[PDB]
Assembly symmetry: D2
Homo-oligomer: 327 residues x 4
């Protein structure tokens, strides 16, 4: 038997004895993801280059892919009737959903990640994280500032050679391939685990001058293992969804450490760092800042940043050992 | 006026007063790429996961993505009645087209490049090179053993977030964006030129222990620049087509130099290095082994390898100088 | 706010305080419908004409569109875990679902209707009807023989210029357009009603020699109104989903009466006549055999036939009056 | 060997030693049809129902399906640099192409036929006719006023369950099936001929009160055959392209004769009757007004009408005889 994402969500929802609100939320985000998909693969681009004529602009003015993505997400989610607060890397402040549509959930997301990679046609993705609104008082940005450990569900869609949605909840990580022919996500990999140890390290080595001595020591090892083993391969697409997914599937390690110009890392805690740490932990891997677990940070600002190192348990443990040795 | 690859090729072919053969070939390649695109993006995969069960395929039958790609390109090209010799990365020997389907052109291609990125859903592409037959002899491999400078047409398809076909001929390099909604490649950038200088270097640094003194020195310069400039960013997707395109479009530099596991480099000269060299040069960029222009190497083995350094001219020459110096 | 079919079903299911079994059933049938869609619009047909080569057959042997359609339906439904008995115009006997997958519902369907229209590329569709298994004893074909009035839900998908799914349940009829770009059904028409009286009659007049005096009288009227009003237009696609849908949307009347060679009508009670009568009644229209309501017939055989006349209330009432006058 | 319309047109064009102009035109038409197909099948309609909300279109802006079709065909054809005069059903006057984009061909087309079937999702199509300029004069309407027998190429696209492009030139009629998955029309039937005799008649019988004695008599014969044969089946989709195609492929007969509301018939001679007449005759069939071959009528008004009777030869002549007799 074949399992579509829609079917899976409904079962999980049925097992968990949900009132159907969370299920609706995931169906929506699934719908959202499929629309972004289409916009990202450039369907109907021929209209932007005057196939039907009547055209005054080869210009900025039309939505960039990012502004489109954000709107799809915001709208589709609001329309699920399951949210009360949304946070988006694209909006300075949290969106508070009108009372008429207010549901019990909070969502943090990055509508289109790997924007540096958009123009070159590289892989780009969508990252989400969902919390249960704990507080009883009016919804506000503070409902977003819950540590990673409170995630009910988190995941990403990767728009690469093909589209994949990865979804992580309390009992594990599942990969659904997208068949755009029928517009359905198929479960192709179940109860996903990352290998204990990989043979690939990912980090922008252009920052070598800015790295702390640990990162420096670690990278040295991978190239010149003291034990004269085979050196790790390097890979860095420049899009976090692409680099992280490759990590989940092939194993190894991904780094975005603090670097002297980015004393607090670059990636965003709530919609970039959080979801991924959650996926990595539910998959048997680790996610640390170098000195603590991402999931445990008590966030203070919805666009706060954080260093992050995630991936195969042994590969990260090895770097945490270098850090403690750097006392 | 919107331009479609079909119209571009026909137009160019008319200007050149061609007899129609090479146009036919180019339309074929184009048809083939569309086909591969579909497979790559996994449309119809639901039928691999039993959506209709298995009674369907009486057979033992299904295709790896790479094999399907190769059957597509072969059949499609053969079908064009324009080729006589074909070289695929996938076959041990040049393929000699049957007399009935034989045309005067020689096509070297990699039907699906970046295969270590296939199972992670990272970017992949198809790479092609076209020549005119240079003998009156029965067609054989000798006909595919020409130097890059004799190419008539070469380019690639990048199956990334969106799909792009880049085509290079004597008069320059044009990029066509695939609009899957209506099945057409739309000319989106015309008579393309690479930035003289770039800000990104692209190379698998895990082979550090194996690089020659020049690549090593050059690498240091990008991380710790002598002018005390900002360092270059690093990007290495793992897929030659994806990494090379980002280079053409943002500028900078891509490297795959020699290493002990490969002394003569990794990438293939005929269907990998050659075509990308032809695009780079038509785009105002440089393509060297570090000692020679890649396009001037007269091959002697269809699966021969070569070291490749390509990208923006100031960048490649800065490295060529490092070589010239050490020598 | 936009309403996808998936979202609608989940709400209705939520209101009705369902245990989620029926919802899953509709999600499945929705998935089923989307797959048939793709097969019907001939996606990937290029493989049937040797685009990738390797081909021994321009032949029967591969599935006809019908055999594919049936399998998609059967499988997808069984996999919803909500059915215990299925009836399909394509299977002599009812399918009894294995206990491991046995759910509480019964489904009667015609995977691809308008098979006479398949070769000419005319509109073809899918028709379904769902019952609640009433009996407490082992599931068997007798669970299918419930009169139309017991339908929990019924509808059809029309594969025409565009794909539409029409769905009818206790509180009304809703039309969802299919956006194959995102693979979603959008609610574009809500709480649908048929107009009281239309200006189009549909029936195969080739059978004029076989018709009863009522049908004959009625057709006379439409052409030569005694009251010297404008005569009705004629329309008959030859595909029941296409003709019926046009009736729902534009109003008027559709006929498939008994004709001397088909003394019991042609269309099938359970998967052809039933669902449509149900849609028509929930839309304010009528569905009679000429002497009684379709929905009220107590069926005796799962492939039993029945005459049927459906459409605008006044238009049908007019023909029921001719019948009683023909005493 | 699989044949794609792109390859078929190029091949045919080479055989004819054309200069490439007419091929370019044909590729354009083909590109246009793909475009219309997308619109017709409602891909991206979700964006009309606020999937991303409305901030999107700052405008007052959206297109009826018929208008979009007409903008596509015009722009696309213009863009081919092959046309000088265009006649669209949608415009009051012939369109004279600007001197810069002017080619030697004249195109008459109906960009979306069967519009009373549009809102019911029934089959619709595009119909085209191509001529060569017959003067040395400044191009004007006079150039579109040629008899059907001077056509160079004509055909249609049927947007039904699947999409088919049928193309007719001096050497015969070929059908290409659209495979939306990869955007290509595949030649599926070659050098097509209609059955000499058919078993289906197609006509709006609501105009019974208005038909001439011959159409009436012929109609009776199909329902009550004098040889006491089985009666013909009836089929009238309401869309000329859909009804005519079924005719070409199953054989039989299609009629749109004179009625008081139309004395000179309904269908247009230039862009409706002409092209379908050209296909029918190339396919071995007949196309009469009832008094003349349709192809021999020299038009005097681009939007002129004509009665049309077409189909299998034994069928049309049987009716022509009824006419000859009454006369
Ligand atoms: N589809 C689902 N998948 C997993 N857990 C769910 C689902 N629906 C509900 N739950 C669980 O039930 C809680 C609330 O249910 P609800 O009222 O449906 O949102 C969530 O916080 C989850 O723990
Ligand atoms: N999605 C739904 N839409 C409409 N009615 C429903 C739905 N789900 C359940 N129901 C009602 O609840 C009954 C059984 O619910 P269930 O156990 O979910 O199948 C059905 O017979 C319907 O009357
Ligand atoms: N579509 C095209 N684009 C660019 N150069 C072309 C094209 N077609 C032919 N050429 C030429 O490259 C050639 C080979 O010619 P032919 O045998 O006509 O295919 C020269 O004939 C030039 O006309
Ligand atoms: N693709 C084609 N299919 C059929 N006939 C064609 C085609 N192209 C041109 N013809 C011709 O119809 C003509 C008009 O020629 P041209 O000016 O070359 O477009 C004659 O030249 C024939 O060669
Ligand atoms: O150029 P840099 O600093 O390596 O940025 C790459 C990172 O930037 C981001 O785009 C920031 O959102 C991530 O997706 C990616 O990991
Ligand atoms: O791990 P490596 O040696 O960098 O391999 C990367 C290269 O391998 C290939 O997959 C082999 O062609 C190229 O696409 C890519 O540039
Ligand atoms: O040729 P006939 O008898 O009019 O058949 C048309 C009818 O046949 C069917 O295909 C029978 O299933 C219906 O879809 C349609 O109404
Ligand atoms: O209702 P009527 O007059 O039969 O109209 C049907 C005809 O009208 C049109 O829509 C007008 O072109 C044709 O496609 C079709 O053949
Ligand atoms: Mg990001
Ligand atoms: Mg390769
Ligand atoms: Mg049927
Ligand atoms: Mg018309």
């Amino acid at each position: 038997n074949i399992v579509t994402l829609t079917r899976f969500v409904m079962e999980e929802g049925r097992k968990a004895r949900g009132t159907g609100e969370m299920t609706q939320l995931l169906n929506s985000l699934c719908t959202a993801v499929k629309a972004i998909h289409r916009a990202v693969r450039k369907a109907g681009i021929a209209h932007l280059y005057g196939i039907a004529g009547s055209t005054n602009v080869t210009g900025d003015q039309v939505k960039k892919l990012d502004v489109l993505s954000n709107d799809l997400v915001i709208n589709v989610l609001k329309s699920s009737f399951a949210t009360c607060v949304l946070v988006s890397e694209e909006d300075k402040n949290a969106i508070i959903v009108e009372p008429e549509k207010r549901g019990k959930y909070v969502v943090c997301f990055d509508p289109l990640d790997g924007s540096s990679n958009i123009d070159c046609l590289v892989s780009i993705g969508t990252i989400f994280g969902i919390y249960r609104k704990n507080s009883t008082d009016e919804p506000s940005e503070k409902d977003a500032l819950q540590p990673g450990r409170n995630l009910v569900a988190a995941g990403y869609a990767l728009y690469g050679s093909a589209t994949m949605l990865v979804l992580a909840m309390v009992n594990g990580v599942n990969c659904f391939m997208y068949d755009p022919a029928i517009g359905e996500f198929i479960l192709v990999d179940r109860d996903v685990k990352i290998k204990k140890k990989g043979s690939i390290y990912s980090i922008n080595e252009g920052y070598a001058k800015e790295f702390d001595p640990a990162i420096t020591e670690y990278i040295q090892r991978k190239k010149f293992p003291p034990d004269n083993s085979a050196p790790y391969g390097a890979r860095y697409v420049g899009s976090m969804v692409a680099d992280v997914h490759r990590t989940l599937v092939y194993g190894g390690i991904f780094m975005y450490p603090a670097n002297k110009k980015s004393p607090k890392g670059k990636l965003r805690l709530l919609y970039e760092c959080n979801p991924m740490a959650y996926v990595m932990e539910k998959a048997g891997g680790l996610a640390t800042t170098g000195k603590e677990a991402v999931l445990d940070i008590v966030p203070t600002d919805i666009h706060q940043r954080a260093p992050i190192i995630l991936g195969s348990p042994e590969d990260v443990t090895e770097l945490l050992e270098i850090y403690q040795k750097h006392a």
